[PDB]
Subunit: 171 residues, 2 copies
């Protein structure tokens, strides 16, 4: 029930702003000074202008390194987020990974849904559950996902903990 | 630190899936059965096909009523979310409001950033802090925002509680 630093980076629903205290709302108390994610009054910096930073709440990183929505942000020059132009990836784009766990479809584009996450999915939030570990040719997970004891790709205590063969294994 | 029903509908960062227990991760434990928001394996239904439902995590509602990202969802037919086509609103579009608290720019388009939220902003997450209440011609907040005792538009205990002149005042 806490957002931002005090909530493990959770994000408020419907673009609600996370105040500097970790609570969700709308208004200057939440959206003004110290806003953490959501519809903050001052846009967070992103991409090239902000060391390759990603925007929260799936916001588009505009060509000038500002987070937002609308033509100016998702339109021409958009450096990340749900950009108006197809985002390439996969063997098709030198092993690039989609930002924010988006699936690299079989064709080399970034999205979320059966078309990207299903059959052929290359990296990200694939729903294919392709096997890893000693159990699977000693193959590794993409996105540095933790290969669990049971030979599964995921993120979490179950995956990243006790039994993790490879991946971002807890240490 | 809880997501979904047990977290007041908080959402995980970077499209992490909220398992049926309110925890954030990646994998079948979180993304499979019972997934709540984030990159769920089965897409949540939206718009027309799902009683005007909005997609979480700012996802695009495709023409067939499915939540996602990429051409198929944000492209042609997109019924909500950060749609590839400008979303109209404001006096320009019969008082329509942007979905998910997006600002209705001075021109009648939906976004988030200074261009929409700043000067001229019509409804949503305006950063203009235009005054309400008895303190302001007895004007009301848009989006049924709570007009606080001090004459401010917001959402939260401070706004919606004790002193609320109009808006979605707590009852």
């Amino acid at each position: 029930q806490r957002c931002g630093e005090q909530g493990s980076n959770m994000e408020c629903p419907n673009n609600l702003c996370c105040s500097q205290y970790g609570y969700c709302g709308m208004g200057g108390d939440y959206c003004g000074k110290g806003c953490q994610n959501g519809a903050c009054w001052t846009s967070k910096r992103c991409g090239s202008q902000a060391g390759g930073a990603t925007c929260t709440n799936n916001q588009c990183c505009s060509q000038y390194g500002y987070c937002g929505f609308g033509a100016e942000y998702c339109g021409a020059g958009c450096q990340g987020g749900p950009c108006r132009a197809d985002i390439k990836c996969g063997s098709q784009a030198g092993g690039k990974l989609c930002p924010n766990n988006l699936c690299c479809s079989q064709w080399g584009f970034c999205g979320l849904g059966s078309e990207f996450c299903g059959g052929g999915c290359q990296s990200g939030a694939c729903s294919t559950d392709k096997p890893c570990g000693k159990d699977a040719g000693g193959r590794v997970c993409t996105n540095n996902y933790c290969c669990s004891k049971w030979g599964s790709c995921g993120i979490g205590p179950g995956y990243c903990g006790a039994g993790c063969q490879s991946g971002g294994c807890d240490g």
